[PDB]
Scaffold this active site. Structure first.
Site, mmCIF file in Angstrom:
data_model
loop_
_atom_site.group_PDB
_atom_site.id
_atom_site.type_symbol
_atom_site.label_atom_id
_atom_site.label_comp_id
_atom_site.label_asym_id
_atom_site.label_seq_id
_atom_site.Cartn_x
_atom_site.Cartn_y
_atom_site.Cartn_z
ATOM 1 N N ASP A 1 6.222 -14.178 10.139
ATOM 2 C CA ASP A 1 5.065 -13.704 9.387
ATOM 3 C C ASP A 1 4.955 -14.382 8.026
ATOM 4 O O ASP A 1 4.664 -13.737 7.016
ATOM 5 C CB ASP A 1 5.111 -12.186 9.222
ATOM 6 C CG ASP A 1 4.254 -11.461 10.242
ATOM 7 O OD1 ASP A 1 4.737 -11.218 11.369
ATOM 8 O OD2 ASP A 1 3.093 -11.132 9.918
ATOM 9 N N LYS B 1 8.559 2.710 2.015
ATOM 10 C CA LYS B 1 7.701 2.345 3.130
ATOM 11 C C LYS B 1 7.919 3.329 4.268
ATOM 12 O O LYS B 1 9.060 3.555 4.691
ATOM 13 C CB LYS B 1 7.998 0.918 3.593
ATOM 14 C CG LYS B 1 7.088 0.396 4.688
ATOM 15 C CD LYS B 1 7.244 -1.112 4.822
ATOM 16 C CE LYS B 1 6.663 -1.629 6.126
ATOM 17 N NZ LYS B 1 5.251 -1.206 6.314
ATOM 18 N N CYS C 1 0.827 -1.203 0.000
ATOM 19 C CA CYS C 1 0.000 0.000 0.000
ATOM 20 C C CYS C 1 0.860 1.252 0.000
ATOM 21 O O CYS C 1 0.364 2.343 -0.276
ATOM 22 C CB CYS C 1 -0.948 0.037 1.203
ATOM 23 S SG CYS C 1 -0.194 -0.246 2.814
ATOM 24 N N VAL C 2 2.131 1.105 0.382
ATOM 25 C CA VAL C 2 3.039 2.241 0.524
ATOM 26 C C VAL C 2 3.343 2.853 -0.840
ATOM 27 O O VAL C 2 2.699 2.510 -1.838
ATOM 28 C CB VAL C 2 4.326 1.828 1.258
ATOM 29 C CG1 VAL C 2 4.117 1.928 2.774
ATOM 30 C CG2 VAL C 2 4.746 0.419 0.857
#
Length: 280
Positions: A141, A44, A19-20
């Site tokens: 993650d 970012k 999204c950055v």
């Protein structure tokens, strides 16, 4: 790892345009160029987490700069100015693996079988590099959202610091190590093989978790084939899907010490990739 001024990234990213943010640089000088030309970067914005100091952050950036690998997103630079903290990575043209697996289709086509095998192998190689002896990094993650694809379908682990895939020992006691990463990788493998999200609430009870929905099918070869993405029909040999499901099931072993290492899954997936398409 280059250092940037806030104005340099200000110019490169069309005034930090949402999204950055997407930016452009001359490949040689790493200076801002006109959009659509040269190297495409992703910048970012990072808020200070845990009151980390300038020196600690710069040290972490320094260690990240040493972790060059074809299956980790390349860190190009950073920015530290008036409390500004920015990171500069290579832009991954094709986004996250999610957009290529799930997505309300009809007019959408997911990754074919060969590229699913290749992407699984690539993610496995990145994670195995992070688990290697000179690195000793836990990714924590492992998610389809964090598998990024470039313009040639090369998969890389998304940017990382120094829910749905949770290992059992993590749910029970908050444990988190390499074997936990391995379990999460097994969940990711189930996602790649079936084309279904790891956690879906629009699924019946006791089946909202992909591992739980797949558990009764992971008992024989015939039933294993039943969970293969139906959009992959005729593309795979049955033994190939059975092999990927086998690697996933061994990764999903309840006792962490029964799960293989990421090097071992790299070997298995590499054999699968090497013999893809032919009976071999």
């Amino acid at each position: 790892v280059k250092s940037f001024t806030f104005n340099e990234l200000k110019l490169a990213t069309r005034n930090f345009r949402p999204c950055v943010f997407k930016g452009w640089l001359d490949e040689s000088t790493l200076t801002p160029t006109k959009p659509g030309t040269g190297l495409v970067i992703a910048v970012k914005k990072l808020n200070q987490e845990g009151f980390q100091g300038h020196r600690e952050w710069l040290t972490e950036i320094n260690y990240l700069g040493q972790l060059s690998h074809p299956n980790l997103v390349k860190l190009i630079g950073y920015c530290l100015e008036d409390e500004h903290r920015l990171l500069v990575y290579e832009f991954m043209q094709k986004g996250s693996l999610e957009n290529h697996l799930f997505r309300r289709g009809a007019y959408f086509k997911p990754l074919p079988w060969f590229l699913r095998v290749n992407v699984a192998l690539d993610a496995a190689k990145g994670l195995a590099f992070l688990h290697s002896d000179p690195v000793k990094v836990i990714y924590r993650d492992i998610k389809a959202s964090n598998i990024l694809l470039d313009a040639d379908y090369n998969a890389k682990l998304s940017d990382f610091g120094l829910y749905g895939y949770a290992a059992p020992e993590y749910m029970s006691s908050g444990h988190l190590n390499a074997r936990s990463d391995v379990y999460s990788f097994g969940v990711l493998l189930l996602e790649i093989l079936s084309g279904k999200r790891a956690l879906d609430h629009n699924r019946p009870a006791k089946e909202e978790n992909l591992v739980d929905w797949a558990r009764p099918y992971l008992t024989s070869k015939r039933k294993v084939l039943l969970i293969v993405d139906n959009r992959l029909d005729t593309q795979y040999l049955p033994e190939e899907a059975v092999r990927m499901a086998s690697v996933a099931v061994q990764c999903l072993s309840f006792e962490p010490k029964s799960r293989p290492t990421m090097d071992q899954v790299v070997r298995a997936l590499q054999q699968l990739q090497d013999n893809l398409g032919k009976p071999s």
